[PDB]
């Protein structure tokens, strides 16, 4: 056997933006409610259970670039 | 047997920006109830119960460039 | 058998920013409440119970770059 | 002349009640908004601009009797 | 001239009750907001401008007797 | 000229009650904002601005009994 491998990257990823101004994020309240018993849970679990969130992320540049490899073998 | 792995990158990730700016996160209240009996967790277990969370993010350049490798072999 | 193995990286993650500038983060208050008996836990586990948390997090620059390795044999 | 006036009340005005018992008031939130320049009042004037406002009134009798006179004479 | 004026009253205003009992009463919140430039206000004047306001009012026994008299002359 | 005037009470205003028992208040939070530039107030005037306001009231009896008179004369 021989095996060969290689992924060459001249990639790019890019942003130019001139301001990100005026951003208001402003929200009202909310009510909830949640009822059970029992709660298992096992192996990999995410769980969110009555959650009241908020969020407001304005990144100047989010260029995500994800990347995997898996050359597995028997 | 014989195995090469190379995975190059002259990979560029980026962000030109003028200015991050006027940025109002301005939540009103509110309300969460949460009731169970019984709560197993077991392995590999993330939860949140009854939360009530807010965030304000505003990195200046938020670039992630996530990467990952398995040469597994028997 | 013969392995090799040679990830290279001139890999660039970068921002330019001009300012962060003007960012009010300003939450209201809020209401939580969790009942239970019982909570068992085990193995590796992350749990949250009850909270009321607000955050800003303003990096000048967060440019985070994630990378693994594995190369397991038998 | 001669007046003469006598209203006579052997009025009742009455409740029985067991239980009052189980009242849940509960409201999510919301959100107002108002705008104006020039907000000019004179004489009796009652305002309200901009509420967000909750009651729960539970009286365990309410039996108002509202009453009026007025012999007026020239 | 003779006037003469005897409102008699043997009025009863009243109320049994056995138990007020369970009473939640349980507003999340919510966002208000006002704007304006002048504001003249004269003689009798009642206002709110901007309110968020909660209330839980449980007499038990709320037997109001509103009465009024005026023999004006001239 | 002759005036005579009289207004004659037995009047009565009651409650029973066994008990007022179980009372809860429990407002999550909230957020208010008012602009102005010039306020101007003359005369009687009442007012509220920019207020979040919470009130529990639990009488155990609010047999509130206004009257009034006036015999005016010229």
């Known amino acids: 056997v021989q095996?060969?491998?290689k992924p060459?990257?001249?990639s790019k990823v890019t942003s130019?933006?001139?301001s990100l101004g005026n951003i208001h994020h402003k929200p009202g309240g909310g009510q909830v409610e949640?009822?059970?018993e029992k709660l298992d849970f096992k192996d990999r679990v995410?769980?969110?259970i009555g959650s009241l969130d908020?969020?407001?992320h304005?990144?100047?540049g989010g260029n995500?670039?994800?990347e995997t490899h898996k050359l597995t073998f028997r």
Chains 1, 2, 3, 4, 5, 6 share one sequence.
Do not use: A
Request: glycine share 8%; aromatic share 4%.
């Open 16 to 18: 130019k933006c001139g």
């Open 8 to 10: 060459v990257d001249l």
């Open 3 to 5: 095996i060969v491998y």
């Open 46 to 48: 995410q769980s969110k």
């Open 58 to 60: 304005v990144p100047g």
């Open 34 to 36: 949640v009822k059970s």
């Open 54 to 56: 908020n969020i407001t």
């Open 64 to 66: 995500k670039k994800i």
